[PDB]
Structure formats: structure tokens, C-alpha cells
Symmetry: D2
Subunit: 244 residues, 4 copies
């Protein structure tokens, strides 16, 4: 029988923030397609989602794969009406040691992928007169961090792109927003020491690291009818690490 | 139930906030400027709320209202500071009273009421202070220097207070409405409303419920890691 | 003989930032009126400025004094065409210990004075089709600081007021801007320990406290013809303490 | 004299910047897209400057140009990254090349040239990197998603780099022009220009010199405590 739920596409859905976002959108009643870089990673997503989603392998650096994935979704599940662009790969270095590849790969994975995927889903959202594009940004697009000139430039570019797109698509009722996580507990933070997690949490007004679910909760809100008059904004979810 | 206090709950944004927080499961105390307005709120909320008269310009009234809530219903654990009164004028025409009354109603009230609810929230290790700001704290609108100053003041206040209270798991945030359909804007002409909605990316005025939805989100466990921020609800009128 | 230079009014000109701003505007060719809270403080300013400025006693909390001072300047020296609103008094306390007076006095000294003085000088600047209103704000209008809810609210209100006023007066070519100092060396910072000044300077990208002259340099730029297309902005002078 | 390198120095904002920095006392190397344009700059600058051909999309050219400057004139101690090329289109019509060419010309060039000048500035314990951004990195203009992304990218880049280089007394800042009169805007109609200047609080388009004045300020000792900021030069078109 036919897939009748609205379709959400969450890139980088294997773990942490992306995993929580995908699961929450399933809970919210979407049919969720999540992506992983590998086929075995995709198969794990398929396992996790069961009969209310699918896992697909996608290297977001490649236009042909983006186009193939979205076409596959359209042909099998439905038009992508919620797009969550989620990527957290970093290639950090002070600028004097930041290579051409450190730069290009991060700009491609983060910002170019947002451009390509957003462009690819617009026709479906225009036809529906409904759409949500939700970009996962970062506190470091706002708060300066040495060694991450590449990642910061990408995330800031994503927020500016989102403003531009929000203006272009707003008459059609499609909203385009970013969520900027702060210090969220991930495999990366789990790998740090307790002392270093304390040094982080002391900087957060709420005195703790966040959880992937806090980011999922923000995305869930923005993807819902409770957020239909919010567009071109950055929703900061950082426990008061960065306020203004 | 936890108690929420929502000022200026008679109509528009305040009324929609109060009704939503009831639906969310809070016991809602709403305030109005007169005893008569307060009765209308009592009548609207029934067993899930109460109406009180309050002139938010008056400290003695603020302290009596909160004391009355503590004695009868319980500690105020969600505070929504909601004011929409304007006294617009170009600066050359803006009187001392136009300046003062807007700074008092909007920003001073936020200082006073926030201070008065700290003790209960501190003891609970739970709190939500949610301040209604405005898009005009960010985008300059000629004639509203008083209103814009007050609301920007509120946002900075909120940041300071979020840092002070965060270890107790009390969040302090602002919601900044854009052009929201009200009696005020219904009273305007068709051409005027058109010029407003043409500035909005979504090409429409918002509704009080859009603001209530944002406050409801922030007041819930779904926003427990969000503090010291401004949640812009303006349809892309202003993007930041 | 008649006073022919354009007149600048710098409130709080006794020391530190205000003193440097007043001296620099004299260097720039203005006739500078500076204010102090006391008559003896005013007399020291008069001494400092010599025949190219004047010191006047002003408690910026009082409308009658504001009106008297500006009238005195108009009657003796000329129309106020550069207004620098400079105040650094604080009454810090966590909100639970912040009195009605802690709140009201800071909002009056900072924000109400900006409203009153700006309003009072507009007629002269309108007639000249030239004006500069330069408000000294603070990094804490942006970067959250516990214990300064009063001061932060005031300074943020000042920046929003400046935007409103800039829009109202822009057709007449009057610019309205704020300068937001960071950690600047003052009597207050001199009173701190060397260890505490180090802890401050480690937070500044430039690895040092600023000087009053750095703020004077910013005000000088904004008051000049080099800044005639800049209005409604905040010029941050903080060594990278706060960037965005 | 200290050497300044100003890209895109042939006309408009770049030309005004280059001429101002000469007046300020810098030896200015200006770049143009062709050998012929480069000669015109040599001819304009005379003994106080030099013109070089540079395609800022090409890393080998960037490295050769800077090497040529180091060998002949001295270390680049002021770098002004100035690009104004647009390839506008609604996203639905924006090609891969429209996206890439604008990201490369604007943001990649800033990455490449900034990296290449660090060593000289580090040794000198003096530097100014001044990046020309745009009001559109802040205020969304439909059709300019590429340009807006690139310039916002530049601003965040600058913040990161300011933190890395600040201990060496190297400042990194952006200047964000609004609507500035150029050949581009001279080519537009009277009605179009009117609609632009009506959005500006000062009710006029700016001039290239207004931008040159801002860059000159930032490049001087008068701005030695300013780093990681955006200096908005837009006549109140956008206020923040």
C-alpha cells in the first residue's frame, strides 16, 4: 500500500544529533529517510526506523548522489517536505596549517550540500505550498573559535543562504531556518575528560552539556505547525553559552 | 499544577498565551488593568485559572498580586511579561511622560516581576521567565524610540538574568513578535495592512496563536536547554 | 571675538574615556564643552581645555540642568553639533539584591539622559543639516554579565534608541551611532590586581587591555567627514573580546 | 614604506581604497584581472604603487603575486580583499558554476590570500587584513544566495582568524558596504536608484570614497584595538 505520511529527509542520521532528530520526526508522524555515508551505515538506519523510514547511503559531497537519493525518495516514498541538513565533520587547523583540502572538503560537505539539497527539494515543496528546510549550524558561526575558520565560514554561509532562501520561498509558505547547537554531549565529548567537560559546562549558564534530544526538540518544533510564522531565523540551543 | 502568571491577558497575544498555557497543563493566573477585565478572565479560565487586576506600573500591586498567588495557588514557576501599549511620536514630539510610561510599563515591570518571582523558582530549581519583546528592538521604526529602547532593554536584561539563574535550571528568554493581527491592526486600512504584509517574507500578518505557540515551546521541557535567547516570530520581516 | 568652531558637548569628561574623547575632539578642531558632576570638577575641565573649550557642572539625572547647560552653550559658544553621551557609573548587584534605586538611577543616568540630551540638540543640528550623536555603550550590552542587568538594559536601550533616531534624522544628514568599549584601562582597572588584569587580557584576542585613546579614536572617526555614510551602527572597540 | 595589497583595484571601491592608502603613506600594490588593467594601475600609482595582473581564482597566481611583492617591495602588511562580482539568480535558476565562481572569487580568495600573508605579518608583529563584505550578508536580498553566503562566510572567517592572530597585533576585520554608486548602479534607471535610496536612512547612495575612508581608518593606528568586527557603511540601510 502507498506511503501516505509526509516525508522528511535527515542527512547524517547515524548517531548523536542526527539520530535524535530522525527518531523524533518519526515520533512526530513523518516517514523519515535518513542518510549515512556507507551502505552498512544506511542498513543500520533502515533497521532503526523499521517500517516508518528508510536508510540510504549518501556522500553529500557528490551532486550525482544527491540527485539520485532525492529521486529515489520521490519514486518510493514521496516528495521531501522536511529537509534537515545535518553535518558535523570538522577538519580543524590554525590557518597557517589549513590545507586546500581541509578548506574545500568542509565548505563542500557543509555549505555546498545545503545549496544542492535545498535546490533539489524546492519543486516538491512549491507544489505542496508546504515546506521546512532546517539547517544544523553551530554556535561557532557566531562565537569565534581559532582553528575552525573553515567550519565557521561554512556554517555562517549556511545561515546567510537560509535568509536568502527564506525570502525567495516565503510567499509559498516554505520556511527556511537554522538550529545552532552549543555544547551537546556526543561521542566527541564523551572522548574528552571529565575535567574538560566540567570546563565546558562551567561556561554554559545552565551548567551542563546539552543532549542530542535538545536539538531534536528544536528541529521538531520548527518542522511543526507551531512554527509556521518563523522563517529566516537561527534558533540557538546552547544553554546560554552564547546569547547575543 | 504548576502556576503560570501572564500579564496583559485580556486580549490578543496575552489571551492566546494564557489559553495555550492552560491547554499545556499550567494553572494560569492572568492579569488585567481593571477588576472588571479580571472577572472576564476568571470566567474564561474557570477551574484552570484565575484573573487578577494589576497595574504593572505599581510596585505595591505587583508585590500584592504575587503574594496573593503564592498564598492561594502556589509559587509562580512560569512568568510571561506581556505588554503591548505604545505611545509613539517622533523624538521631537515625544514627551517625558510618553518616554517614562512606556519604559515603566514594559521594562520596569519586567525588572520588578522577575525579581519578585526568583525566590520560588530558586527553591523549585525550575523556572521559565518569558518576556515579550518586539521586532522593533532590532529593526528601527521611526516614532517608536521609547518602545524600541524598552524592548531592547528587556532583551539585555534577560541575558543578564539568564546568566544569574541558569545554575538553578531557570531559563530566561524573549519572544519578539513581528506584525501580528490585532484590534489595533484590524482598525487600520486595507492599504496599510498590505504595506505591512508586503514586508513579511510569508506575505501575511501573523496571529496571536503564533506567539502563544512560541511561548508554549519555551515554557515546556522541549526548550530546557534554551536560555538567554530571542525567539523571532515575524514571518521573515526581520531575519537574524 | 566670536566663537567660530563647531561645538561638541562631551558628558562625563573628567577622566578616562571621557577625558580622552574631549581632548581628541579639541585636537580635531572642535570647541569642546565637557561636563562633570561637580563645580570643582567643571573648573578642572575648564583648566584642561583652555581657550578652546569649557567645563560645566551637570547632573545628567536632572532635566532642568540638561536644559540649562545646553542653553548656556548655545548662548555663549554655539549650537551643539557633536553630542557625546558618556557615562560609566554602575550600581551592580545580582537581581535578588538589586534595589529600586540601583535600577532607576542607572536607567536615568544612562538611557534617560541620552533621550533628553539627544532631544534637546536636535533643533540645532536640523538647522545646520549636520550633526553627530555618539553614544558610549558597552560590550555588556551584547555579552551577558551577571550583576549588571540594569547597566546592560540601559546600554542596549541606548543602542536601540540610536537606531530609531538615526532613521528619523537621516534625511537631514545627522548620524546617530554608538561606540561599545571592551576592557579599557581606567582607574577602575588600575585598582584591580595584575593577576586579574592578566585574566582579562587573556580573553582579548589582542592580548591586552585597551586605552581611553582607542575609544577617543573611534569617536573622532565617527564625528568626522570620514564617517558621513555611517549611521545607526555600533562600533565595537574591544580588541576581539566580543566579535559577533 | 609598508606595503599594502588591494585586490580588484581598477575602479569603484577598490580604486578608491588604493588611492586612499597611498595618501595615507602605504606603498600600494593593486591588482587587476588583465595585464592591461595592471598597466593602468602602474600608471595611476607612479612611484607610490605598482599594478599586477591577478586572477584571484587561481592559487598559483596568488602565490606568484605575493612572492613577487616580497621580492621587489617588501612584506604585505595590509591586505584588502576586495571583490564585487555577482552572478545573481533565484535559487531555482542558480547553476553550479554561478554558485562556485562566486564562492571562489569572494571567499576562497580570502582564505588563500590571508593564509599567504600570515608569515610576513607574524614576523613584523603588525598586520591589517580588511575584507570587503556586504550589507547583503545581513539583510537577505532574493537572488543573491551565493553572494550572501560568500560574504557571511568571509565575516566568520575573519572572526576565527582574528582570534588566531591577535597576539601578534594583527587585526582582521570586515567592511560591509551598502548601496554604493558604481558603474553598475549608474547603468540602472532613475526609478530603480530612487527605490534604493529610499531604503537608506541618509536618503542617498554612498560613494566609493566612503568605503575607502572606512578601510583607511581600520588600516591605521586609530583602529589598533579593533579586531574581528564588521564595520557597516550603509547609510542606515541596515542597522546593527
Amino acid at each position: 500500500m502507498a506511503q501516505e505520511r509526509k516525508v522528511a529527509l535527515v542527512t547524517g542520521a547515524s548517531r548523536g544529533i542526527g539520530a535524535a532528530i530522525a527518531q523524533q520526526l518519526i515520533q512526530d508522524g513523518y516517514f523519515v529517510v535518513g542518510t549515512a555515508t556507507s551502505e552498512s551505515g544506511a542498513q543500520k538506519l533502515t533497521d532503526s526506523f523499521g517500517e516508518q523510514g528508510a536508510g540510504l547511503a549518501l556522500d553529500v559531497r557528490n551532486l550525482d548522489e544527491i540527485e539520485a537519493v532525492v529521486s529515489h525518495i520521490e519514486q518510493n516514498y514521496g516528495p521531501v517536505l522536511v529537509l534537515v541538513n545535518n553535518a558535523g565533520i570538522t577538519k580543524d587547523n590554525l590557518l597557517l596549517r589549513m590545507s586546500e583540502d581541509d578548506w574545500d572538503d568542509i565548505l563542500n560537505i557543509h555549505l555546498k550540500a545545503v545549496y544542492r539539497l535545498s535546490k533539489r527539494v524546492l519543486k516538491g515543496m512549491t507544489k505542496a505550498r508546504f515546506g521546512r528546510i532546517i539547517n544544523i549550524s553551530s554556535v561557532v558561526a557566531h562565537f569565534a573559535n581559532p582553528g575552525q575558520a573553515n567550519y565557521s565560514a561554512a556554517k555562517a554561509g549556511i545561515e546567510a543562504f537560509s535568509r536568502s532562501l527564506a525570502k525567495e520561498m516565503g510567499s509559498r509558505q516554505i520556511t527556511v531556518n537554522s538550529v545552532a547547537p552549543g555544547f551537546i554531549a556526543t561521542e566527541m565529548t564523551d572522548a574528552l575528560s571529565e575535567d574538560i567537560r566540567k570546563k565546558m559546562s562551567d561556561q554554559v549558564a545552565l551548567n551542563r552539556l546539552g543532549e542530542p534530544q535538545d536539538i531534536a526538540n528544536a528541529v521538531s518544533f520548527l518542522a511543526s505547525d507551531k512554527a509556521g510564522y518563523i522563517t529566516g531565523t537561527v534558533l540557538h540551543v546552547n544553554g546560554g553559552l552564547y546569547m547575543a
